[PDB]
RNA sequence: UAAGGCGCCCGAUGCCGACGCUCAUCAGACCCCAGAAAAGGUGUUGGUUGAUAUAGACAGCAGGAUGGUGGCCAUGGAAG
């Protein structure tokens, strides 16, 4: 029978404490080779957490990735992936480009749960801020960049 | 007449006294004088000052009460 489940993963880091075999167990497939397919499938993040549906069968589970609009920022900042001893106030700093902001606006766009693609762009810059990274400057300049010279196809 | 008094002891309001204030399960009641403070009261009576009201109050009841987002630096999970 077809059923989904979310699981907030850690990724392509393979996790020691996992809650893997709470849900999948009664459902039927192994969960230390659900944790292992998981770590495969996502792969291009390496170091983020994705929510990740997991549309299963009778037989095995398939992977379908789903990114949020903050998963896909953290996901634009390349910035070293560290080891797991995980030093504190990692909190980024760095550079987004104007083009990735339009390039998750039309993500968000065919994802169908927004405004129109004006409105799209300060829901993810609203969230940029979020993130807790500037695009030369932060939203509230972006406001000024928002109005009399929007950059809106 | 003074200072004191004038329900009764106890002489004098047995004034058609005036206007208020206060309810005390510890009421209060006249210099020296014989007993109380800080603090507090949505008890009540005054005031002071500043805001709210046909561009609609204050309660009251009944309705949205979400959303990018289940935000992330993330803590096994924290999604108000």
New binding site residues.
């Given amino acids: 029978e077809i059923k989904v489940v979310?699981l907030?993963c850690t990724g392509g880091e393979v996790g020691a404490?996992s809650?893997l075999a709470p849900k999948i167990g009664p459902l039927g497939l192994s969960p230390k080779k659900v944790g292992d397919d998981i770590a495969k499938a996502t792969g291009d993040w390496k170091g983020?957490?994705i929510?990740v549906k997991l549309t299963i069968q009778n037989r095995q589970a398939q992977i379908e990735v789903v990114p949020?609009?903050?998963?896909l920022i953290?996901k634009a900042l390349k910035e070293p992936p560290r080891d797991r001893k995980?030093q504190k106030?990692?909190?980024?700093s760095g550079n987004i480009t104007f083009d990735e902001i339009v390039n998750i606006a039309r993500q968000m766009r065919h994802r169908s749960?927004?405004?129109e693609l004006s409105?799209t762009i300060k829901?993810i810059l609203?969230?940029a801020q979020?993130?807790?990274c500037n695009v030369d400057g932060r939203h509230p300049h972006d406001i000024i960049d928002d109005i009399n010279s929007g950059a809106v196809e």
């Fill in positions: 979310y907030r404490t809650a983020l957490r929510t949020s609009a903050s998963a953290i995980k106030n990692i909190k980024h749960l927004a405004r409105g829901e609203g969230t979020s993130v807790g």
